Design a protein around this ligand. Structure first.
Ligand SMILES: C=C[C@@]1(C)CC(=O)[C@]2(O)[C@@]3(C)[C@@H](O)CCC(C)(C)[C@@H]3[C@H](O)[C@H](OC(=O)CCCCN3CCN(C)CC3)[C@@]2(C)O1
Ligand SMILES: C=C[C@@]1(C)CC(=O)[C@]2(O)[C@@]3(C)[C@@H](O)CCC(C)(C)[C@@H]3[C@H](O)[C@H](OC(=O)CCCCN3CCN(C)CC3)[C@@]2(C)O1
Ligand SMILES: Nc1nc2c(ncn2[C@@H]2O[C@H](COP(=O)(O)OP(=O)(O)OP(O)(O)=S)[C@@H](O)[C@H]2O)c(=O)[nH]1
Ligand SMILES: Nc1nc2c(ncn2[C@@H]2O[C@H](COP(=O)(O)OP(=O)(O)OP(O)(O)=S)[C@@H](O)[C@H]2O)c(=O)[nH]1
Ligand SMILES: [Mg+2]
Ligand SMILES: [Mg+2]
Lengths: 190, 339, 189, 190, 189, 339
């Protein structure tokens, strides 16, 4: 308002954050033209944006081959955990379809976590809606310490799922140092 | 709701006296725990004694014991200096006390500005026989003296005549100053704390930067801060007691650390205390005017500076000056409430 | 969306920020932290309004990393590459100003590279402008493997910068995921 | 001899160079004690050294979790290609045995190439027998650009194998930049 | 084989060597190249015979990377860490001498770290002494992510080196495979 | 087998004349390709003309044309300067020649030490009408003049009275010196080449380091090399023709680039050529003695230096001095064969 520029950010609890990367994305970039790459990419992400609206996830950003969204925004929902899992399901099938077309071995790696966030925009120019917090950080590390073709979830994301989905030991502490060092019990959806 | 409360931020250099002010607020306005703090008092006693003996040899010229016998007690003290969990056995107090009686040790204490020594030294050492008791219960003045370094930000709440206060305590040492920012927005007023007595001392952080100078430089940073343009400062010129003692002692002169004090003549509006030496008046006002030169040179009636000669260990002086402020804080939370 | 031949891309990140980031009751669960980041990113955006930086196009911020490019408003020759560098120095100065007032010490870590890209919009929902290409990934790696208070540039970018009057020092070699090893330089002040 | 220190190195043609790494070695190191790790490692490598003598490969060095040898040394053999493949077979089974014991998902990744080398020792102190050349470099990149649980071989290694083994397209140009940039036709043994 | 508590490990590599390496008829298919590497590694081994480096234990050479450790001949305290550093400088001086005569310009890239290791023999055939541990991997990464003519050290290693009288500058942060991100420093001359 | 052959290494700075010596060895001792080299001769002609015109303006004081008309030919030359695959159309030769006739252009040619100009300039420009012919066949003297920079190491083999030679050619420019090492082991003798005439010139690499000085410094590096303790140097003081021309021209004095030449008086053992000016003698010997001071000051009868005044473009002078060496090379491959 007066001495600090007005901030367009607000706290939100009970949300679930999804992160996904493209497994073998670099080998795909090796095969095709610079242009054809941007179309496969641009097309796949156009598809993901649809699934987002269906599954009730608000898409945040696209950073290269890293896609992420969050259910529970803009307005609060109980299903927030189930939505992201569902989105995660769809994303994994969708990528396998474009895996046919290209004939290359690409796949999605998903990671989800639940907790609070701060959402909004930073700075003055080129506003892009974003989310920030330790929970968002954890979710990203969940994606990073994930497993190919699988939805990697946390402790917190299991207590909002009401055990509707069936999981198994996740062993995320051995694929990511942050998961190790923070004693995070991870699971994989069946 | 949020506006009926006054959020106060205590800023100032390390060991200036900020944590003590919060203590006084608990004494004064806040409704089994005294047991835990005994450990920390015993620690101050230990740290004090060992710091003085260690210094004896390292000073130039070095300082000898008055009694050659005490050499063994010196060895004893030095030998248990870095001990992890120290027992505080009965011998410790006897050795410690004997040393404090030694005239050559006190000689080294008088030159303490030449090294780093905690403020509660003489106070605690003078009451070893009180503190060693195993049924010992710390007085209130003991809790005020107990020195523990602050790292982080600690909020205290209180109420005065149903008026609410949220006080914020922070670390004043350099590494800690980076956390201050997280209280700048929504602050009602600054209470900047200064160790008036430390004109003959350097800071711990480098053993070279003069403590009063560091305070001035830090004040300037806060005063001309880009996020504090609106915010007024309540300047506490703390440790007025220690200052006076140093002035009357006449050992180390102020003119030797701040040559400008040589030009200084005492102001007109000066309101000396009853039976206050004119030289003490002259000194404390000089120190105030060094900070007023900083605040005068900028701000443009956008924020203001209100000085107060203080002594944080004195609960009486603090009740008085804090009431002096309750006045202005109301008026300040009103200026920002409108503009 | 179209393609370009010689766009200069820059990533400037603040490594020490995540450490500063904390969540507690005192700082409104990390909000007072983001408040500072806002003042920083905003202080960086102010630079875009300088006549000398009218060629600079801010692409986005990733976490606390600022991403910008020169030469999108195009169709003497390599003068926009030097501009990107002047801009990096500009950011450093702004960040130093923040330090003065926040009693902190954030250092900037920069990576610049130039070459062919593909600019355009992506996504169905809220279509947003992004650029793609090896040229951009490499710039990213120049940052991620760079040093504090240093601008790391590729060999060719280095070559050009010298024709413009800057000197460079070989950092050594770096392994790029997919491009193999490659030689880099730090710009001198 | 006189102005340059005497070199203990000699050229050798018609040799085949094998490189192997431990897939998921880091996740294994996450699970066990520092000591237990060195024993699993030390034990596995003691086993590999046996297979080496059997399969006629001369073991060169152990660098962390990277093991490498070469058939055709010390003295020339025709079977040099078949030996390394055979060694590669054994190594892949052996690792799966210790994968049981630990219960962790570790596996070997093999890479082989054939050509000339220089072998010997460098410097004065702590002599360790070694091999050097572009072919050795290529073989290492073959390991690096390899595929889990598989023996990744080259063009040159197929013309010495006399097609006794059955292979398939290797696609190594998309897993390693050196393989890409040098136009190397890779294959995978069935 | 036994374990230790405070061993100082060092990797010194020559990034520019592989470029120099060539195979042609003129240089006996790369043999004249290895001949130079021999003169270098041998010139480095000569340093071990200096009384001041009698604590230094050469472990091996990996390609053109020299690996050595101080404090294996153990059971004031951290004086062997400073020794390892003096040794790195020693290598740089030897390498400069080579340059004078080879009309080349190889720069050394160094990484040092200290901590618990496990020393011993491995393999059935020709049993050879190697050391293992996180302490050693990290030292390796200090080299691989280091800068030319620079000694890169971990934070704790940094701390100790300062008690001994050296100053350090924060390089920034580095991601270690398995240990996450971590802060590093360059030693000053 | 391996010992019945003499491996010779040609070392020396860039453009000193090394590649030319190898050429002479083909002329002299070695048994359709002249077609390819015409392209490169045409390139030298082009590079020469455009370098002189470009320099005219950049010199201080600048140089004007003698005929204002030629300005357009200057534009023509400058316009096709960086052209990729140049056609060498009939006009090019007319424009080029006209420029070379212009007296003000030759004025700029005389100051060529003040910039970088290839050696074969005047030679080629003087025979444009010969070179433009489309049935043109390069003489042998043309091939000797044709300037192409060497990058890499090139081996040449020959036989003389059934004695074998393996000659190694290398790049003499700084970036190239790093490859030399790969020939140091197994070398029979060094033939170090020097451009005697270049005392008034700086090297390309920085446009500041004096060419003769760079040659001295480079010689010192080779002479006191740690891997060349045994190896003797056959010092070719090349370009004796150009040297003499510069000495007689009396335009630029040697004493101005190497003040020590002022002290120099001509030696006793000096064996001047028939009808050689005493000043030419004095000069060439001075240049030799600068290199002899380097070799004298170390080596300890472990290796030796044999000077020869040479001219690589002159096939006759080369046959003579090379035979002078065939002698010593036998004797040298014998010293190392025993010790
Ligand atoms: C601002 C505070 C803090 C601490 C909290 C936070 O949520 C982040 O903003 C996220 C997590 C969060 O905004 C989600 C996006 C992204 C990009 C993941 C941010 C970065 O990792 C930030 O840190 C950085 O700027 C450094 C890491 C950025 C590298 N990312 C890693 C993930 N891949 C997939 C894309 C690039 C971040 C961690 O910083
Ligand atoms: C000496 C010349 C040259 C060019 C040729 C050569 O054969 C090498 O010595 C090998 C290939 C070769 O000796 C096999 C072992 C190893 C260690 C693979 C060497 C290094 O890669 C060398 O380069 C290096 O010193 C840098 C790379 C070293 C990193 N390696 C990569 C493979 N992992 C498995 C272990 C560590 C090398 C390539 O250098
Ligand atoms: N004599 C005297 N001692 C005082 C006075 N004010 C504070 N002290 C003493 O100074 C010591 C340090 O004060 P303290 O309150 O710890 O400073 P601080 O500013 O909180 O220090 P930090 O947290 O930034 S490191 C205390 O142990 C207390 O005894 C005073 O006015 N007079
Ligand atoms: N007038 C004259 N010209 C000479 C003489 N020796 C060589 N040149 C000329 O110098 C030019 C360059 O000589 P060149 O043989 O190319 O040197 P270089 O040492 O091989 O050069 P580099 O390969 O290190 S860059 C040639 O074009 C040739 O005309 C000589 O003695 N007299
Ligand atoms: Mg405090
Ligand atoms: Mg040549």
């Amino acid at each position: 308002d007066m001495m600090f520029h007005k901030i367009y950010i607000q706290k939100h609890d009970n949300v679930s954050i999804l992160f996904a990367d493209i497994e073998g994305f670099t080998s795909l970039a090796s095969q095709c033209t610079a242009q054809e790459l941007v179309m496969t990419l641009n097309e796949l992400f156009a598809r993901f944006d649809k699934l987002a609206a269906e599954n009730h996830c608000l898409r945040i950003k696209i950073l290269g081959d890293c896609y992420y969204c969050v259910s529970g925004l803009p307005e609060a929902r109980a299903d927030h955990a189930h939505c992201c899992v569902e989105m995660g399901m769809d994303m994994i099938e969708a990528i396998s379809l474009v895996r046919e077309m290209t004939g290359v071995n690409v796949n999605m790696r998903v990671g989800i976590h639940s907790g609070r966030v701060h959402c909004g925009v930073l700075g003055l120019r080129k506003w892009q809606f974003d989310v920030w917090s330790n929970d968002v950080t954890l979710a990203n590390h969940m994606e990073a310490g994930g497993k190919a073709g699988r939805i990697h979830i946390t402790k917190a994301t299991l207590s909002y799922l009401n055990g509707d989905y069936e999981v198994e030991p996740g062993c995320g502490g051995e694929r990511n140092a942050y998961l190790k060092e923070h004693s995070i019990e991870t699971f994989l959806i069946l | 709701v949020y506006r009926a409360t006054h959020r106060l931020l205590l800023l100032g250099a390390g060991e200036s006296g900020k944590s003590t002010i919060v203590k006084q607020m608990r004494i004064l306005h806040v409704n089994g725990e005294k047991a835990t703090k005994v450990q920390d008092i015993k620690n101050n006693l230990k740290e004090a004694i060992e710091t003085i003996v260690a210094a004896m040899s390292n000073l130039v010229p070095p300082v000898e014991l008055a009694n050659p016998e005490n050499q063994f007690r010196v060895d004893y003290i030095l030998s248990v200096m870095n001990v992890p969990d120290f027992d505080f056995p009965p011998e410790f107090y006897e050795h410690a006390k004997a040393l404090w009686e030694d005239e050559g040790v006190r000689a080294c204490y008088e030159r303490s500005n030449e090294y780093q020594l905690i403020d509660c030294a003489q106070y605690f050492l003078d009451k070893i026989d009180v503190i060693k008791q195993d049924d010992y219960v710390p007085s209130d003045q003991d809790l005020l003296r107990c020195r523990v370094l602050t790292s982080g930000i600690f909020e205290t709440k209180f109420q005065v005549d149903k008026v609410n206060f949220h006080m914020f305590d922070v670390g004043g040492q350099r590494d800690e100053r980076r956390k201050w920012i997280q209280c700048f927005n929504d602050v009602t007023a600054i209470i900047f704390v200064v160790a008036s007595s430390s004109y003959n001392m350097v800071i711990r952080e480098d053993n070279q930067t003069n403590r009063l100078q560091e305070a001035l430089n830090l004040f300037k940073s806060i005063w001309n801060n880009r996020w504090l343009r609106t915010i007024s400062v309540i300047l506490f010129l703390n440790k007025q007691d220690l200052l006076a003692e140093k002035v009357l002692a006449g050992k180390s002169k102020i003119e030797d650390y701040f040559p400008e004090f040589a030009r200084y003549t005492t102001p007109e509006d000066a309101t000396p205390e009853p039976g206050e030496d004119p030289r003490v008046t002259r000194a404390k006002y000089f120190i105030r005017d060094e900070f007023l030169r900083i605040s005068t040179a900028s701000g443009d009636g956008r924020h203001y500076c209100y000085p107060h000669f203080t002594c944080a260990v004195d609960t009486e002086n603090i009740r008085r000056v804090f009431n002096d402020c309750r006045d202005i804080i109301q008026r300040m939370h009103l200026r920002q409430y409108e503009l | 969306h179209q393609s370009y031949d010689c766009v200069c891309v820059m990533f400037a990140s603040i490594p020490d920020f995540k450490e500063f980031y904390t969540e507690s009751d005192v700082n409104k669960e990390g909000l007072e932290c983001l408040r500072l980041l806002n003042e920083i990113i905003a202080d960086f955006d102010d630079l875009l309004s300088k006549p000398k930086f009218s060629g600079v196009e801010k692409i986005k911020t990733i976490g606390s990393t600022y991403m910008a490019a020169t030469g999108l408003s195009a169709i003497r020759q390599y003068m926009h590459i030097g501009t990107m560098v002047e801009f990096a120095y500009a950011l450093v100065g702004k960040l130093d100003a923040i330090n003065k007032h926040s009693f902190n010490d954030f250092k900037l870590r920069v990576g610049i590279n130039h070459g062919p890209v593909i600019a355009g919009v992506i996504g169905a929902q809220k279509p947003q402008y992004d650029i793609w290409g090896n040229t951009v990934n490499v710039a990213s790696r120049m940052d991620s493997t760079g040093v504090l208070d240093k601008i790391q540039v590729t060999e060719e970018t280095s070559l050009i910068l010298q024709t413009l009057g800057y000197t460079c020092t070989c950092r050594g070699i770096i392994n790029v995921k997919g491009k193999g090893d490659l030689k880099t330089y730090f710009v001198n002040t």
